[PDB]
Amino acid sequence: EGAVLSFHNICYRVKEILSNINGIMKPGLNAILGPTGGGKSSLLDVLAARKDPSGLSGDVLINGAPRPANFKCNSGYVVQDDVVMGTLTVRENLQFSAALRLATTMTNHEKNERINRVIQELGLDKVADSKVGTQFIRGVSGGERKRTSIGMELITDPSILFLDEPTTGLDSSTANAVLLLLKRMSKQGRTIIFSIHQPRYSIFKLFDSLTLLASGRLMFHGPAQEALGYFESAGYHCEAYNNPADFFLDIINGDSTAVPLIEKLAEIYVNSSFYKETKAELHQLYTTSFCHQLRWVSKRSFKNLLGNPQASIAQIIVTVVLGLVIGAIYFGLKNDSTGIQNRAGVLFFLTTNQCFSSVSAVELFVVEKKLFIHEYISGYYRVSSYFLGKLLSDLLPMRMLPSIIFTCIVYFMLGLKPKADAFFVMMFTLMMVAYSASSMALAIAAGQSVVSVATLLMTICFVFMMIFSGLLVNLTTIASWLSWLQYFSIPRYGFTALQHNEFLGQNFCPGLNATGNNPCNYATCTGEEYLVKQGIDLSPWGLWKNHVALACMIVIFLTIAYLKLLFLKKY
Amino acid sequence: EGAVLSFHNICYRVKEILSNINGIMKPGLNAILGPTGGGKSSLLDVLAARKDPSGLSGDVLINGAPRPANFKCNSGYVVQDDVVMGTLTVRENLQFSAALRLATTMTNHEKNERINRVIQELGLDKVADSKVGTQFIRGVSGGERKRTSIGMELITDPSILFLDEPTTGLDSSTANAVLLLLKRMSKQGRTIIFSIHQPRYSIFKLFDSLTLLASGRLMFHGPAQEALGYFESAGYHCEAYNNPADFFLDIINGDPLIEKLAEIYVNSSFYKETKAELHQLYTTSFCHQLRWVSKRSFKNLLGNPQASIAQIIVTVVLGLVIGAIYFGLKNDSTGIQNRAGVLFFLTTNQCFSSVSAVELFVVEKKLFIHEYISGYYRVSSYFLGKLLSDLLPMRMLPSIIFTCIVYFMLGLKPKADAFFVMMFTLMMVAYSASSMALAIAAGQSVVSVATLLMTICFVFMMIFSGLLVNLTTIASWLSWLQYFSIPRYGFTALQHNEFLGQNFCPGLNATGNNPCNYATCTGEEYLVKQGIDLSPWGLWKNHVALACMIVIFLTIAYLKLLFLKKY
């Protein structure tokens, strides 16, 4: 029933971050204070085993016997910024956590009964079926979003529960409310260790242990109220009607006056009657399958896709109105000398528009990076199942739609080659171009935190790629030390496939038959002359050569994105 | 020597924002507290006369006689987020404030002596010549950036000094430091009125008056320590080791409550004597502002090594790439396609690289509002100075270096006028696109919406350029849209300059007559096939269309700045 998290002689380098630090965390409600420059948040990441174990130079023991390998699984860590998803209910978030974290042996009834128990302990009955939500669609208050995030780690019943600053970002009455909630939760035999940033007296009066940290040195460790009892014996009387936490942070900033400060306070405490008995206390001392994770990550990602009416509907609206505009400008393509220019221009516009609208695949792996790191090291899934699920539920149904609706709108308004295979090869080429551009987007933007640099990098890359398309330059006139760059051009393969599909068997000189022979050359009367003038093969291997080049680019870029996710700094 | 800012019966609508509010601000160190939902920041904006005077329904009096017209000139307002410019020193910021705010009669010696007096009062000798700076280039700490911003309004010697939350965003020891600085500054006979957000006891123990505000109602007004003396008499027993400011903000929420506390304040022994106290009751020229705004903007331009050097680097490497792909334009049937493609790429690249003129009038909007209503300059001088020192030297360079790189690598028409008309056309296209950028992005706060609006506008504009569509084949109910197209005028001028007098059929002379038409052998046939006039009025027709677009878009941007909500 008890859970003592002892720790002894913890030094750390990445910069000596944490100096000589000792301490015992009884099963009460423990607290870590200090300024932000000190190791207040670094000690919590060391004790929760989510900092990388190279620089750790001490033993963290749990009830005697040392810390196990999978310690992060039987534990909790409430991150400071909430990584709960807004476009879901509370009960669906708890179902996701219970389905990916509990065993596979219990069925829906017991898991629902546990979720009902957790949602009935924290008091979330009024919002048990409402969306969590941000200020983009109707959602709950920020005082219960935090306890929703707290309830996501109480499903596995941890005896030790870590929290990173559960008051930063909240208003006052809600902060007092969840502090009283944690105070009530602590007395069931659960160790609660948390950092906090400048608490008030109504929060400080309910602690059970205190750990002051400034510049990586230990200023105090003991009971919480004995800190006020102890700092008067060092020659620092606390003024009446003054907050003791503000008193400690003031006397540690040097602003308070007694009535190299950090080292001096460190060993004015090291030789006190609080260090010795703590030293005596120290001296007597996967879960699921691949298919299950794939199904659940894909289900949650698809619910988030249809629960966000920004990136799902507005893309379809702008695609439909752009198709109506393009079908209205190029209405009735004729076979004059201006029939070549209109066809080349509209096919260039399609293959450029696909690559430039596929630039918005940045925000697949950047706006949820912290959620991915947290749920990977918490032991939910593996990297390949997350990658396959996020891919299969976000890239496919939103890149396979605009090519279909775009071709179906513009193909009969323009009046292109009236066959069936000429329709379906055009649709397939637009699909492959969109998939190749989104694959390059994922290969560039994976493992990033800032969104802008990948968008600007892809912007200059796609400006360099569309010169080699075959419209602005003739690809048979570039010098041979430079013409090899055209094989790194997705719009070149798309434009070449569309031009080979469209221009074969056309006559563009009205009144003149130039198939048997061309009288008076420099005439460009046929479509085959236009294709050979651009450097395009006339055999049926040119079209599918472009298609297999696009498929190889898809496979290579997706493999690079997966290896960039797998080799991420996940700590 | 004293400066009492009295105020009496102040109601306000934009929503009744401020209810029945009375108060006296003695020349000490006054404080306004309360939650953020209350009128803590709204009363400070009402008393500082930088909220618009429609909804104000009471009299704010200064030493008796009412508030004058130019009250914001003989005053100070330290905004909460610092609008000081990082790419300048402290002494240059104080020189800018002293040159645009003091009189023109005093010369450099007395103004420098005043700046030395201010910089020697606030303790800025160690950073008097260092750049203020952000985390983009070496700069000073955030504890003296705030007092640098405080010193920018102490040049005109105000007797009343307003501050909007001088502790939000700072660390603790620095916040205590500038609070002790304001405490020392108050005892020279200077009224200091400020809002603050959740102070500690070491800050609360040095106040002189208090004004609690919750939901627009007055909860308390009097001396600061009598608030804890007063709240026990209402039946709120004060706990020891508790901060009194946290005690007031806690008993406002929980230890019709607001109305009830309002009229137990209203019938107390603090409301009556305050009611008795209430019942016994440009600077420069246009050329000077133009010179100083242009000088500060040019120093900020050369002090930021992002938008000045990297543009030139990407322009030089893009010119080297374009000169390497199109090396040696010949006169075959593929000589028309290469020329049309490279000229389309130049006129598209100018309009799309001129999209980054968003951040001229969006990333300094709050500084513009603050220094306009503080009485520095007028709108036309700011507009002309910012224009003349940011748009001209950074849009007139890439056309010159781009033409000088690509014109002889490509091998275009080897004359001098064909070189200079190309350079002039690229200049006019860049200026027209930046003018449309300023006309869209003026008076905005968010940066992204103007960039996306210009992006869809320039995608719609480059279809009408003359390359993707033949402009003589569009239906007549739709072809009138081509006159709203900057790349059409640029591309038409470049094509008329380039293609005249060229032969593209090798071995065939097609100037006297064209044997076997559908041949496109000459450049005049290519120009007439696109719809371009062959007279010398087509080129300069495109140029005067670009000049008219420049003038119209700059006038629209100036009228959008002048009609801004400047309050």
Epitope: N517, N521, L538 | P506, G507
Partner: antibody, heavy 118, light 107 residues
Framework: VQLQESGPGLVKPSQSLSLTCTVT?????????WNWIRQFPGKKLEWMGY???????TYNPSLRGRISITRDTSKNQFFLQLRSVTPEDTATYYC????????????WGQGTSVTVSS | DIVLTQSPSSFSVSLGDRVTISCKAS??????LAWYQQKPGNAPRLLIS???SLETGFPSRFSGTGSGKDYTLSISSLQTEDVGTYYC?????????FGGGTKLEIR
């Protein structure tokens, strides 16, 4: 229409080459393109390069800077200047015309032989 | 560039019969092919332009067919003046290339 080649037929190696084709019956500024074709022993033709009616030239890429073709409009002549003469090109040099509307080499010269040796 | 391959480097024909000379291109020419005839001691003489169009000054026993990369010159019932070398030239891409030459000899 009528073309004749003339010039030296015995040149030293790594020295120079200078031919001259004199057109009669047509003005070389007017309508055609005027080119040079050489034929090796063990007959195998090769096209060297032309000069247009307006003055532009285009050469074979297998003659990298060695060939230069000029003209003399006041007397209806165009010249061939082949520098750094290897003992490989012991060919027979023809001057021809090229219409471009038709596309083929219509009229030819009768041909002179250049025997480079020592 | 575009190399032109004449695989029958030498024929062996008698009077009266029909002979076909074949030319083969590397890339696509699109009927931009010409046929020449070089008697010994003379200059080459144009025979067929545009790969099918026999020009004036020649009897109508010569004919050209073919499309794409395959081309052929046919001399049906060859007479006694048809001893000579026959070349094929492309004029599609500007470095114009000639064939290897096909030498006809009489028996």
């Amino acid at each position: 229409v009528q073309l004749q080649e003339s010039g030296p037929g015995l040149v030293k190696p790594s020295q120079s080459l200078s031919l001259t084709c004199t057109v009669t019956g047509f003005s070389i500024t007017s309508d055609y393109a005027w080119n040079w074709i050489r034929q090796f022993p063990g007959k195998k033709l090769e096209w060297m390069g032309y000069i247009n009616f307006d003055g532009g030239t285009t050469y074979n890429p297998s003659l990298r800077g060695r060939i230069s073709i000029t003209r003399d409009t006041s007397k209806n002549q165009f010249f061939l200047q082949l520098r750094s003469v290897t003992p490989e090109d012991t060919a027979t040099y023809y001057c021809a015309t090229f219409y471009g509307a038709k596309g083929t080499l219509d009229y030819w010269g009768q041909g002179t032989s250049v025997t480079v040796s020592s | 560039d575009i190399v032109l391959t004449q695989s029958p480097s030498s024929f062996s024909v008698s009077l009266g019969d029909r002979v076909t000379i074949s030319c083969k291109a590397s890339g696509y020419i699109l009927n931009r092919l010409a046929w020449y005839q070089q008697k010994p001691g003379n200059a080459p003489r144009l025979l067929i332009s545009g790969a099918t169009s026999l020009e004036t000054g020649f009897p109508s026993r010569f004919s050209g067919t073919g499309s794409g990369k395959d081309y052929t010159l046919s001399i049906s019932s060859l007479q006694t003046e048809d001893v000579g070398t026959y070349y094929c030239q492309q004029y599609w891409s500007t470095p114009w290339t000639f064939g290897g030459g096909t030498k006809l000899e009489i028996r």
